[PDB]
DNA sequence: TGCGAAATTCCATGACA
DNA sequence: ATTGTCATGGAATTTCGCA
DNA sequence: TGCGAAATTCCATGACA
DNA sequence: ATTGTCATGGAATTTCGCA
């Protein structure tokens, strides 16, 4: 068997609704699985529509052999495989109601629920801007199984970027009583 | 003047008229037989004045003034007066071409890292597609990488919408631009030390600068224009399909794809290399970091016959950048203050600014 | 095909397949074990479609083709197939630069006679002056000598005026002129006729052809500046001295002016010649007989290490000579009818029209 | 003595009131000593303004040592004077009521009256278009005297239009009784 | 240990406004 | 305070298949 | 029959849209 | 059925003045 390898698998997702910001609604979530790489792509809504037009943005950049996702309505139209086809790449089911990712990309997800939640109280509505450093600050993130962060293992140098705080990522005490403040 | 000439006329000798040939008086003026014929020798209190006629006759150059002069007159060294002159002619100096060529360009060393440099331009207007009419190419110095960016003016706003998508991936250290309205404005400086990534300038007027995305520009339209041969020029849908279209070409000098240097492997595209299928991912950049320091790097070629280059305090005038129809194509000239590689120089204008400057923008003052 | 490889697959010998090599089966597909690694050999059925492929992701050159293709298979004579394709593909051969110069320049001899050839020429338009934009430049073949007409257009009846002027002086063999609107309009034809004045045109958009007036016109300009430095550039009333300035010139290389050509002796003008003072005007013309047969002329240059010369029979593009944005820099291939001399031929446009063209607008059609 | 040469001295003269022709009334009349070779200008007026206009499209060609005139009033005014002077040409009056030239000017002279009148009769408002052929004719006329045309001694060479028919020039008798009825 | 032919490398040419 | 670049396709050179 | 310096010639460079 | 040209100013070469 082969050793795993960057653009092997993406794993896709999306996140919302959220606040409105700018216009946008949701988050796709793209993460390779080899290296934990993370591309965010804000959209207007969950559809077969919005992934394309998205994924044909990462997918000038990169294609991958393999897409895996839960079976949202969004990835398992026949308009989003015809996409795939037409791309050769092979689209990938986890079985309803019990999703499989695996160890490195689970807690990936984890991470970004948690970097998102964090970040949008205080500023809910602001988030479209911040999905930049969201991003590299994932992707600059050390790894305990591996010794390398996804910019490492993506692109085989050290960033411009380094992000040194391993950050607190829980909800600090006043952000805990203001969040549910924001939710009344 | 008259003093010099009476001591020749009583047949003393002089420094500079040879003693061999007969010189008189006649018609009040002092003559001399030359085997060209019989020529006047003015005072030298004359001289200048004479010189000056001839020239401006038609502003010539130096054997083109001396003929004229010649066929009247005769009197020592008669071209150092000529060349004294050329060299005070405003006129002359500041619309006249330049004869002697810069000299051989310099080849920078490629970009250690991807992200070290990024290079960036605009191309367009482009026929309208979409109510787009303009392109952002990014191109990383290192692996050749491109990015692209349809855009509706070649603005700061333009690029730093674009910019901030692209830094999702990676923050550059620098980028480097020509002198675009777009990437000189203090907006864009402001956004980029936010970022804490240098700004880098191309000297004005000098394109070759920005060299490595000027010439991607180039595969960007030839393939564009190829891909529409028959068609409406809907550029706008195609960008995406000609980004990944390049970043995954072969340069036939260096064996690897733009993609290969950035990533050590092949996504999933048509005819995807696999040597690497049975590395780790460890082992697999650990060839990658090897195949990156032995890529082969150009030399400085050989300096034509007649060029020149640059010297602290030398005399050299900048190209007028978009001269007026019959004005000159050159400032006045100017002072090298420094040179900072044998291709770039920095000069005091008169004004007197401190400009960074290409010597391909200028010539060095003729005749001192 | 499978015929072929079947064969192949037995351990026997086919033409092309070296028999070092061990040849299987494995997935449905025939393989091969070379020194890079397995590589697919596909039938023989099935590979154009596969150079097809590789070519059409970026319509790249031999190598760049090659090198996607040599990812996955491999076939005897590989590049072979690559060339084939190349040489097919509309798009990359109306789109692609040449990248063989043409051949050296030729000198053709200067005209024997004053008023045997002019060159006419229009510059323009210049800042209005007294309502007059252009300029005529008109400069005999043999001498230099130039005429110079302020004109509101560069148009046949405006030609015509000047001309009626001129040609009071003497009518001349022949006018070369460009492709102008002004010069092949069948009025103008009509009025040299009338004259028996015999006209010549240089190829299309090839200026080097009418080379000794566009020098002048440099003359011209350059003079014009200079006169005009801190003045607003009211040139009209300049046309006039500049002409006398230039016609009374020396060329460095001759050691005569225009004037002299033209006449064998100076008039009243600065600096005058004397040197003929003293022959009677039938000596005198007899010395210039003999100064017009003496004048140096240049050679054919060396040709570049990579030129083309045209051969009858060949394909050869003509580049467009004003395309529109992002559409291709060349014609389709055309056939060589006739080798006029080494720089100009007449070819078959697939239209087909003849038409003369020079080679400096002609690239050989690549890959045969 | 030098011999005689080409510029050495320029002869002038006007001729008309004309039959106007396309708004002009007199020729200027210029003709070169040592070699007869003849220059004309249409002009509005024998003033010494119409005249400075013309000769400064010639003398933007060449330039004569020497100007020779009666003394006309264009050609003894002050500001032919300076125009003169500025370009370093001598100038040269006849004395008044006794106009000489030389014997091969005297005869050019008479040649251009009667070549004109010739053509004046039958388009007597035509000759502005026809003062080109006009002079081209002059110009390659044999000289009886020297061997050559003025063209030939201008410029050393034969031209492209020798004038083969050493014309008429008289009036033809149906030209005689027309002439008396243009006049009438 | 050397031949013919194929493969690879060299590099002038030209175009990015 | 900065600096030319590189796809391209014939030709020149090297390597390959075989002996 | 030779030296130093001035004169002349050579010629690459660049610009005519 | 047509085709490059030539001013320019440093450098390279030749000639000049003298002996
Ligand atoms: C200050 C200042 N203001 N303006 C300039 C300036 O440079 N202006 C021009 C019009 C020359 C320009 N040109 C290019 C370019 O691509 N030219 C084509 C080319 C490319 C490569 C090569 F080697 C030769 C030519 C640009 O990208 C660009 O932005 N500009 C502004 O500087
Ligand atoms: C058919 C047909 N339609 N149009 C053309 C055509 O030639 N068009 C252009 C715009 C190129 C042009 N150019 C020049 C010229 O002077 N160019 C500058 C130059 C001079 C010398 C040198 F060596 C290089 C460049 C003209 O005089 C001229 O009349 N034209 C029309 O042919
Ligand atoms: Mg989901
Ligand atoms: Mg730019
Ligand atoms: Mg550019
Ligand atoms: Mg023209
Ligand atoms: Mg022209
Ligand atoms: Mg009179
Ligand atoms: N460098
Ligand atoms: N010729
Ligand atoms: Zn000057
Ligand atoms: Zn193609």
Request: proline fraction near 8%.
């Amino acid at each position: 068997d082969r050793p795993q390898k960057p653009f092997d698998k993406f794993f896709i997702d999306y996140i919302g609704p959220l606040p409105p910001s700018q216009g946008y609604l949701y988050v796709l979530v793209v993460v390779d699985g080899m290296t934990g790489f993370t591309w965010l792509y804000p959209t207007k809504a969950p559809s077969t529509s919005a992934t394309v037009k998205s994924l044909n943005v990462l997918t000038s950049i990169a294609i991958p052999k393999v897409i895996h996702s839960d079976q949202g309505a969004a990835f398992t139209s026949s308009t989003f495989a015809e996409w795939a086809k037409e791309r050769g790449i092979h689209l990938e089911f986890s079985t309803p109601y019990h999703p499989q990712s695996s160890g490195k990309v689970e807690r990936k997800n984890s991470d970004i629920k948690r970097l998102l939640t964090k970040l949008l109280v205080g500023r809910p509505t602001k988030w479209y801007d911040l999905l930049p450093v969201v991003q590299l600050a994932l992707n600059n993130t050390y790894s305990p199984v591996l010794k390398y962060t996804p910019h490492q293992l993506l692109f085989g140098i050290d960033s411009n970027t380094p992000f040194a705080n391993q950050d607190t990522l829980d909800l600090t005490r006043e952000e805990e009583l203001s969040l549910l403040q924001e939710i009344r | 003047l008259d003093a010099e000439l009476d001591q020749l006329l009583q047949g003393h000798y002089i420094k500079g008229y040879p003693k061999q040939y007969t010189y008189f008086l006649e018609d009040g003026k002092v003559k001399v037989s030359r085997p060209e014929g019989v020529k006047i020798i003015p005072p030298q209190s004359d001289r200048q004045k004479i010189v000056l006629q001839a020239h401006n006759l038609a502003h010539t150059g130096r054997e083109a003034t001396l003929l004229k002069i010649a066929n009247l007159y005769w009197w020592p060294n008669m071209r150092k007066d000529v060349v004294k002159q050329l060299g005070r002619c405003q006129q002359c100096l500041i619309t006249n071409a330049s004869n002697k060529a810069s000299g051989p360009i310099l080849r920078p060393d490629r970009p250690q890292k991807p992200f070290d440099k990024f290079f960036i331009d605009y191309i367009g207007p482009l026929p309208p597609s979409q109510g787009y009419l303009y392109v952002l190419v990014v191109v990383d110095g290192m692996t050749g990488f491109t990015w692209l960016y349809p855009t509706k003016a070649p603005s700061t706003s333009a690029t730093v919408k674009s910019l901030n998508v692209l830094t999702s991936i990676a923050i550059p250290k620098v980028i480097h631009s020509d002198q675009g309205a777009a990437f000189t404005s203090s907006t864009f400086a402001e956004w980029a030390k936010e970022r804490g990534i240098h700004l880098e300038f191309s000297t004005p007027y000098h394109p070759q600068s920005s060299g490595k995305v000027e010439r991607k520009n180039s595969d960007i339209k030839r393939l564009l224009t190829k891909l529409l041969v028959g068609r409406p020029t809907k550029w706008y849908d195609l960008l995406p399909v000609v980004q990944l279209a390049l970043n995954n070409t072969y340069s036939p000098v260096l064996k690897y794809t733009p993609h290969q240097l950035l990533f050590g492997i092949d996504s999933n595209t048509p005819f995807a290399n696999q040597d690497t299928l049975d590395l780790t991912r460890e082992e697999e950049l650990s060839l990658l970091q090897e195949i990156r320091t032995s890529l082969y790097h150009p030399s400085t070629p050989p300096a034509s016959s007649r060029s020149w280059s640059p010297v602290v305090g030398q005399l050299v005038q900048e190209r007028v950048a978009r001269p007026a129809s019959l004005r000159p194509r050159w400032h006045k000239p100017s002072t090298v203050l420094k040179v900072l590689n044998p291709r770039t120089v920095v000069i005091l204008d008169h004004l007197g600014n401190n400009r960074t400057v290409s010597i391909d923008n200028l010539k060095p003052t003729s005749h001192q």
